[PDB]
């Protein structure tokens, strides 16, 4: 074939190319709102099974952000109610909302959710390119626009883990956790044909390799870790994967906040898509480094020896092996299909 026969199938595993941003923490672009610059998610692939854990809270992150006189920790990350309604929104209501937008009405549910989230422009800057990320719940078929685009915050200086301090900034981190298995984390850039060009399911009886001299050889170096099941391996790969989070702390609070993706304060919005329309929150919100996709994004899970083999070089072929399942940080942590 005068070339690597695996090329078409393996294109979706070139995560620098097809995703192009962090996975664990995605903050791969910057956008301005009225002369202030903010970090925001920019990955082109959906991230299956990713949610945000809020430390020492029973409140889940898809809960609306605290508004009005609510305490910060009694809320989550999601858009609060708006007039007219925007989030959360069922797939069916999204299609109705955009029925007269030709280029949007028939998008697949994930791309539609992303475009829906990206419709609102903070009303302080009509020309802003700031677009909020979203989470789609595949079980409920419901799109949640995220008001908070930050994905990790830690350090006693920058958050407070104490449950009795209700209005102090909470600590949080991204995770693949069974409670998030039906969630899909979506940046503003998710491509319309993700079904074809991005990973989703784990590959049964296959392990990643490199195409060398007309044969598929093992990845030259892998890091082998104990992992009891495939889900645990997917979690380990996710934790090691491309990340746009700062590795250190900035002394100044406002600089650290910017660096972790603190965003604009908006109470009203306009729309990118016709018809032009004002959208306002029901209640105002509580007042209280780029990987470009490079990292340890891939794993070969040995189901016999219970070893997660994690590596940071893009794979270019598959090896048939009934003891292996091939995973990526983008992949769903449970779903599998045959190679």
Numbering used by the authors: 105 to 392, 420 to 470
Extract from the study:
Clear, contiguous electron density in the apical groove of Fusion-FD12 enabled unambiguous tracing of the entire PfRON2L sequence. Moreover, RON2L in the fusion and binary complex overlay with an rmsd of 0.53 Å over 34 Cα positions. The core interactions between RON2L and AMA1 are retained in Fusion-FD12 including R376 of PfRON2L (R2041 in PfRON2) that docks into a pocket at the end of the PfAMA1 apical groove, and P368 (P2033 in PfRON2) that docks into a pocket formed by Y142, Y234, and Y236. Overall, all the AMA1 loops (1b, c, d, and f) that pack against the C-terminal end of the RON2L sequence are highly conserved (rmsd of 0.21 Å over 76 Cα positions) relative to the binary complex. Notably, the sidechain of E136 on loop 1a is displaced by 2.5 Å and no longer forms a hydrogen bond with the sidechain of N233 positioned on loop 1e.
Invasion of human erythrocytes by Plasmodium falciparum (Pf) merozoites relies on the interaction between two parasite proteins: apical membrane antigen 1 (AMA1) and rhoptry neck protein 2 (RON2). AMA1 is comprised of three domains with domains 1 and 2 together forming a hydrophobic groove, the binding site for RON2L. To advance vaccine development, here we engineered chimeric antigens by replacing the AMA1 DII loop, displaced upon ligand binding, with RON2L.
